[PDB]
Design a protein around this ligand. Structure first.
Ligand SMILES: [Mg+2]
Ligand SMILES: [Zn+2]
Ligand SMILES: [Zn+2]
Lengths: 182, 112, 15, 147, 391, 136, 43, 262, 30, 56, 65, 49
């Protein structure tokens, strides 16, 4: 996102606002035809593509509402302050710094990092249903779970990964007990 | 190929007593008896009843290892009170408790 | 604390 | 394996009536071992199992998206109201004696993955198989009757 | 396979279903666990080898490691968790049960000991039952801090004739210690007896654990809402103790003592403050727990975890690190752009002041990935150097 | 058969250290000023009040032991019935604390008894696996 | 199948570590363990 | 008389009761009987005539296992093994077959109710597939579009749930006692208050409050239990307990019988 | 309103477009 | 290395391991199959000739 | 795929609830928690199954055969 | 649900992986604190597009 500093409020905010978003789900929910697609955000100067070299030069914000307006649960993680004036960008959403593999872990922000790394490797040999057309491919060594189940603790990302239509496991009623030694 | 059948989880093996009347030597008028082809339900009862006869010194059982329908059962009585003939006196009794219960539930039901 | 989708019912109505 | 690097295997199978059970009559699919937790830090594996329980009660889908405000306390009270112990714990009954269990059990659903590494692919034994060409040694390779 | 005792000669019990199947307490030497590891087997073909195997490479013979003159096989897992609860004073066991537990021990004479309580309600105490499996003759005693022949907080060990008398059986006694039990039986009655001892102590303590059950759960990671306050106070003093120091350097009014630069001394000045504060916190959370709190038991049982684990769960995660230095200014003068430059502040350079319970904040999370990998690389190489070196 | 040792012991104090059933007791002879006791018990089955003068009996056996515990029948002219409370254990330490001040150390199955007093009163206490019988 | 397509590679300072600059560019979490820890990394 | 059974609720298909005046393992093993050794018919061997469908064969044949069947007159059927018959007959089994066709243009479902018995029941009352929906559409088996066929033959046999869940007459069994924790077989773990965050059993009505401020009747034993059986429709619930107990009676009496072979 | 400043939960809208725009193989297909 | 200090040998088996409390500290469970393939010769003597004959 | 026949843990009646489940949603604009409720699934091991099935076969059927 | 991203060679799904390289046309400085007489090395790996 592109912070904007000279703004009607007399301080910084985002060039993106509600109407923009409104037409989005509007265009999303065609599915008349105006197609307020991602591209439009660009040529409207809404969000700016940014690379590594460029980052050296800027000062980004974690979450907009978190930070941009100048200004509680004990169970909440403790969050940093908005002292920083000259923000020029705000992150789209930080949970978008994870690979395909990571954003299938529930709550990857509560575990111990190598666990994730272990998890990252593991799904890639979790069996599941790799591709719906499967009945007609003549591949070798394809493995298909029977009654795949969409998980419970999903993750706002994973929808995009269409996991919830080709899931790779089952919810199971597990009990953490020292039952019989075995 | 390595898989044992399933009737003889209850079907008597041939030339094999369903039980095994085995004297033990560790205690007088004690005994250990081997049960082919069954499981806790049969077992655990047969203990509990045997903790209520008064003429019994000791009674306990275990399943050695999950994979067979055998557990083992150990009775010790007071002197001159055979544990075989302490089984009947137990076992006769349970059916009594059921032929008591069942009909004392049969007539609990025609009431519906 | 949940996932809600049909707000197309809202958004097409809110529109 | 769980979704957190708890790759484990199947110790053993217990048909249902041996599985320890709760008052409600549920019986766990699958039992893991508390010593799995402590030095795996696999806290998220707990919270999922909690949240997943709440979801299957309410009907929603637990949002396990990371950097979200959704604390534990929030999840907890939500669980409580549905009539369960706040921390997902439950009374459970041993399945052999049909007795109470002198301590209470963690309990919920939780997403599990299966993995390729089935045993029937990993077993083989060899007593005078076929030798190599070169050193007349027993051949290698599991599919090939290797040594 | 890089012990002598990485290969031993087990007796064969032919079973059903298609895994290799083995008793746990020998899983420590193979450094093996059941997360899928495979294992090879070899069958000798002529008598001498069988004799050569049996009389040398049998497991029971291999129990004191000639490596560091102590046993290489404690009683280590949930059993070691299970055994703890059992030998507690608070515990008592009743006839119906005491009966069965005794039957399990297969070496058993057939003599019901006296219950430690009659009138009312004949009733045993765990320690006694356990004293069945232990063979006679044993004498063993160890006096911890504050162990007295009365033992008010129930420390130490004292066993006589094969009769536990006081103390709470645990790792330091039945694990793989210096001169805990298994060491002693071995020397006294040879291995063969000790082999049975491992068997029986497992058949009992499991059985009693089965019907006692044991579990864990998030609650075990929740602390007293108040003591959470103090954690935060200890968090605070640090930042104070951190912020204070910082100006002292910028005031140019800092002295590194002779040997290290201004900045390097500034580092040790800081990072100490962080670790100690984190540790100063974890202490409290660990202290605040109940004897109920299962993980607090697991650690007290010595079977898993340690102070650090729980301190990382509930108290705080504390400073991440690469190369032992703090996180480094990766871009110019700032690790991550979401911060300005010259910002050395603990949270910027890569402190972590939540705890695994209450989630990690993107900057923190990223940071915590850094060190988490650094371990992995190190693990990878530190093996490959070791494996080669040892070769 | 016989009381190996008896005397009154007023409950001077009771401390329930972290234990749900189990407590630390302090009692002393009325008869002789120097005879004392700290002993554990399961309170439930005999819970406790400060300054209860407790006469205390030990009585190495029952009739008036290489013996698998047996369930009573009837009219078993045992002991401990006119006594309130009973256990089973064995000594493990004959500590001679001073001049004829002695102490013994009885664990009962994990339950800890520590007398102290005059040897001369305590002559009867020699490595018998004794019982414990307190009333009132 | 997906992540595979968004893999990278790096044949062969310390190029196995996880530099600040990888923020949001390559996954701070996923990397196969062993010989290629670090040198394989997914977008 | 012996133990007592206060039947509280009876759904068409669920039976609750309190099990009064009874020892514990008794209560248990009545239950584990209920789950495990209730003889029952169910589809086992699955010949396939013709499968166009998208499902792998046994994947069908699998679920064809778990289709509950009328099983009142089950005892008038004897077991497969005990059939000297040519491996099945009207004495041992029921043979069902199926004629499913993807004819219409919309997707065409499949249900149990599309099954046909093909064997001389001797008028028996077993095997009629179980339709616990009003609409007379039973279990969903499979989906057919335009132009997919399924013809097949099936043999169903007697058996008990232990041999394969399919033979289960029983579903999840409620079980509780001492709902009031008066017995102390269990220690309520807690952070603050067993009272506060431990919902009282439904059953806590049925037995008094703990009238606390009282000494502990250590000698209290368990009886007056709280169970809620729940069948599938393989047999209605009252016939389960009947078949449940009579089984256990038929069990112990076996021991004595062979015992009498001293 | 139409010019109102945004809330986090919006962004998922923004994102879901981005993928609808591109997909996951983008640089490959590009 | 690959063919003198170490080599592919016969009379071997390998699989995954599973814990078990009910096995004696020196025991090992062998999958009933594996045992059927591995073997070990034995010499007829007056003693085992009986049993051996029966095995055959 | 297809709507497993009865649940792994409980085993209560699912191979009927399936489409009944649906009409509820479309016709009654009805929430899930409410839905499974008036489906008569008061336990939750079941309140797992149907809640997280995936009816895939409604994809395969698209293919010409 | 497929997404392409790849080829088929002799009928088998191959995939080009991103390889990675140093970027061309970059001035770069290092040290060489090896005792060699060259205590700083600036480089550039010129490439023609
Ligand atoms: Mg392993
Ligand atoms: Zn027949
Ligand atoms: Zn269910």
């Amino acid at each position: 996102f592109i912070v904007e500093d000279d703004e009607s409020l007399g301080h910084k905010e985002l060039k993106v606002r509600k109407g923009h978003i409104a037409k989005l789900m509007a265009t999303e929910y065609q599915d008349d035809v105006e197609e307020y697609t991602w591209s439009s955000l660009l040529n409207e100067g809404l969000v700016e593509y940014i690379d590594a070299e460029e980052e050296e030069s800027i000062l980004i914000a974690m979450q907009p509402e978190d930070l941009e307006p100048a200004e509680v649960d004990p169970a909440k993680r403790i969050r940093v302050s908005h002292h920083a004036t000259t923000f020029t960008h705000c992150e789209i959403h930080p949970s978008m710094i994870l690979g395909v593999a990571a954003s299938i872990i529930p709550f990857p922000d509560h575990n111990q990092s190598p666990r994730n790394t272990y998890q990252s490797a593991m799904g890639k040999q979790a069996m599941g249903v790799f591709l719906t057309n499967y009945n007609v491919r003549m591949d070798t060594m394809a493995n298909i779970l029977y009654y795949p189940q969409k998980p419970l603790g999903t993750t706002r990302a994973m929808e995009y990964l269409k996991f919830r239509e080709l899931p790779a496991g089952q919810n199971a009623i597990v009990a953490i007990a020292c039952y019989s030694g075995y | 190929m390595n898989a044992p059948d399933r009737f003889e989880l209850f079907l008597l093996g041939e030339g094999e007593s369903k039980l095994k009347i085995d004297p033990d030597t560790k205690a007088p008028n004690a005994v250990v008896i081997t049960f082919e082809k069954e499981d806790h339900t049969l077992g655990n009862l047969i203990r509990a009843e045997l903790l209520n006869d008064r003429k019994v010194l000791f009674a306990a059982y275990k399943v050695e290892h999950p994979f067979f329908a055998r557990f083992k059962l150990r009775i010790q009585t007071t002197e001159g009170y055979d544990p075989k003939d302490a089984l009947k006196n137990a076992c006769n009794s349970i059916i009594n408790k059921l032929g008591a219960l069942k009909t004392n539930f049969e007539t609990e039901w025609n009431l519906q | 604390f949940i996932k809600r989708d049909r707000m197309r019912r809202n958004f097409l109505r809110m529109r | 394996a769980s979704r957190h690097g708890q790759k484990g295997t199947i110790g053993i199978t217990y048909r249902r009536e041996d599985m320890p059970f709760t008052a409600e009559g549920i019986v766990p699919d699958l039992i893991i071992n508390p010593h799995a937790i402590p030095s795996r830090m696999t806290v998220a594996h707990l919270i999922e199992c909690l949240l997943s329980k709440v979801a299957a009660l309410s009907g929603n889908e637990g949002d396990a998206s990371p950097f979200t405000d959704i604390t534990v306390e929030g999840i907890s009270k939500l669980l409580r109201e549905h009539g369960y112990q706040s921390r997902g714990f439950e009374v459970m009954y041993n399945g052999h004696t049909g007795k109470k269990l002198m301590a209470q059990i963690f309990f919920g659903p939780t997403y599990y993955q299966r993995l390729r590494h089935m045993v029937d692919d990993k077993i083989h034994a060899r007593a005078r198989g076929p030798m190599q060409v070169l050193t007349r040694q027993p051949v290698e390779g599991r599919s090939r009757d290797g040594g | 396979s890089l012990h002598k005792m990485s290969m031993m000669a087990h007796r064969v019990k032919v079973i059903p279903y298609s895994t290799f199947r083995l008793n746990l307490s020998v899983t420590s030497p193979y450094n093996a666990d059941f997360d899928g590891d495979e294992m090879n087997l070899h069958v000798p073909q002529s008598e001498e080898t069988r004799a050569e195997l049996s009389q040398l490479c049998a497991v029971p013979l291999q129990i004191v490691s000639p490596q560091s003159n102590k046993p290489c096989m404690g009683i280590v897992q949930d059993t070691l968790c299970g055994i703890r609860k059992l030998t507690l004073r608070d515990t008592f066991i009743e006839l119906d049960q005491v009966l069965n537990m005794l039957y399990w021990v297969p070496d058993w004479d057939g003599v019901i000991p006296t219950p430690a309580i009659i009138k009312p309600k004949p009733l045993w105490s765990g320690k006694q039952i356990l004293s069945v499996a232990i063979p006679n003759g044993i004498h063993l005693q160890r006096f911890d801090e504050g162990t007295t022949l009365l033992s008010p907080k129930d420390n130490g060990m004292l066993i006589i004739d094969g009769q536990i008398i006081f103390g709470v059986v645990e790792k330091k006694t039945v694990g793989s210690s210096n001169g805990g039990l298994i060491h002693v039986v071995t020397r006294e009655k040879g291995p063969q007896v000790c082999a049975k001892l491992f068997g029986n102590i497992q058949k009992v303590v499991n059985f009693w654990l089965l019907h006692n059950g044991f579990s864990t759960g998030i609650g075990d990671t929740i602390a007293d809402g108040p003591t959470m306050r103090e954690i935060t106070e200890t968090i605070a003093e640090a930042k104070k103790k951190v912020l204070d120091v910082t100006k002292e350097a910028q005031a140019n009014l800092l002295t590194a003592k002779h040997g290290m630069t201004l900045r390097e001394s500034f580092e040790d000045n800081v990072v100490r403050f962080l670790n100690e504060a984190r540790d100063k916190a974890g202490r409290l959370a660990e202290v605040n727990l109940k004897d109920l709190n299962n993980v607090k038991q697991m650690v007290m049982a010595g079977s898993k975890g340690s102070f650090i684990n729980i301190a990382q769960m509930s108290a705080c995660v504390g400073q991440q690190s690469v190369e032992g230095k703090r996180i480094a200014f990766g871009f110019v003068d700032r690790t991550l752009p979401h911060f300005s430059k010259d910002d050395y502040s603990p949270e910027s350079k890569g402190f972590v002041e939540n705890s695994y319970l209450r989630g990690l904040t993107p900057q923190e999370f990223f940071f915590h990935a850094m060190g988490g990998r650094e371990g992995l690389i190190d693990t990878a190489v530190k093996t490959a150097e070791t494996g080669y070196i040892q070769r | 058969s016989n009381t190996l040792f008896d005397d009154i012991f007023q409950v001077s104090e009771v401390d329930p250290g972290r234990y749900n059933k189990v407590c630390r007791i302090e009692a002393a002879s009325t008869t002789q000023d120097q005879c004392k006791l700290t002993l554990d018990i399961n309170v439930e089955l005999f819970p406790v009040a400060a300054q209860d003068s407790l006469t205390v009996t030990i009585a190495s056996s029952l009739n008036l032991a290489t013996r698998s515990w047996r369930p009573p029948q009837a009219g078993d002219r045992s002991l401990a019935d006119d006594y309130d409370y009973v256990m089973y254990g064995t000594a493990y330490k004959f500590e001679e604390v001073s001049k004829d001040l002695i102490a013994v150390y009885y664990s009962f199955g994990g339950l800890l008894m520590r007398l102290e007093g005059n040897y001369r009163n305590l002559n009867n206490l020699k490595q018998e696996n004794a019982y414990l019988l307190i009333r009132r | 199948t997906l992540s595979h397509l968004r893999r990278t590679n790096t044949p062969i300072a310390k190029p196995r570590q996880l530099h600040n600059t990888h923020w949001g560019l390559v996954c701070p979490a996923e990397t196969p363990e062993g010989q290629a820890c670090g040198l394989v990394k997914n977008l | 008389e012996g133990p007592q059974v206060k039947i509280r609720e009876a759904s068409k298909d669920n039976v609750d009761f309190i099990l009064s005046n009874v020892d514990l393992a008794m209560a248990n093993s009545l239950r584990r009987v209920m789950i495990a050794e209730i003889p029952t018919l169910a589809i086992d061997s699955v010949e396939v005539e013709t499968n166009t469908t998208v499902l792998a064969d046994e994947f069908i044949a699998h679920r064809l296992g778990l289709i509950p069947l009328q099983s009142m007159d089950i005892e008038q059927l004897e077991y497969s093994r005990d059939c000297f018959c040519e491996d099945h007959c009207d004495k041992c089994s029921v043979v069902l077959t199926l004629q499913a066709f993807g004819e219409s243009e919309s997707t065409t479902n499949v249900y149990s109710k599309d099954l046909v018995i093909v064997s001389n029941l001797m008028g028996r009352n077993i095997g009629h597939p179980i339709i616990q929906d009003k609409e007379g559409n039973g279990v969903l088996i499979c989906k057919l579009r335009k132009g997919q066929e399924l013809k097949l033959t099936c043999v169903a046999k007697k058996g008990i749930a232990k041999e394969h869940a399919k033979w289960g007459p029983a579903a999840a069994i409620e079980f509780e006692y001492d709902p009031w924790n008066k017995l102390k077989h269990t220690d309520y773990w807690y952070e603050q208050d067993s009272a506060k965050e431990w919902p009282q059993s439904k059953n806590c009505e049925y037995e008094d409050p703990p009238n606390e401020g009282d000494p502990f009747d250590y000698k209290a034993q368990a009886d007056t239990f709280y169970m809620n059986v729940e069948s599938v429709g393989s047999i209605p619930v009252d016939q389960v307990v009947v078949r449940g107990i009579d089984t256990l009676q038929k069990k112990v009496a076996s021991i004595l019988l062979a015992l009498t072979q001293m | 309103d139409e010019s109102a400043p945004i809330t986090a939960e919006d962004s998922w809208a923004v994102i879901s477009a981005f993928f609808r725009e591109k997909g996951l193989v983008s640089q490959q297909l590009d | 290395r690959g063919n003198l200090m170490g080599k592919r040998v016969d009379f071997s088996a390998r699989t995954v391991i599973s814990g078990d409390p009910n096995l004696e500290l020196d025991q090992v469970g062998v999958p009933k199959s594996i045992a059927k393939t591995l073997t070990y010769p034995e010499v007829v003597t007056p003693y085992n000739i009986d049993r051996l004959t029966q095995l055959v | 795929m297809i709507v497993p026949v009865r649940c792994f843990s409980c085993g209560k009646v699912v191979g009927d609830k399936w489409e009944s489940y649906l009409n509820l949603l479309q016709e009654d604009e009805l929430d899930e928690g409410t839905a499974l409720s008036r489906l008569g699934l008061k336990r939750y091991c079941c309140r797992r199954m149907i809640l997280t099935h995936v009816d895939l076969i409604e994809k395969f059927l698209r293919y010409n055969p | 649900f497929d997404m392409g991203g790849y080829f088929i060679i002799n009928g088998s799904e191959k995939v080009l992986i991103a390889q990675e390289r140093s970027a061309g046309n970059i001035v770069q400085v290092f040290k060489k604190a090896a005792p060699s007489p060259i205590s700083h090395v600036a480089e550039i790996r010129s490439a023609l597009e």
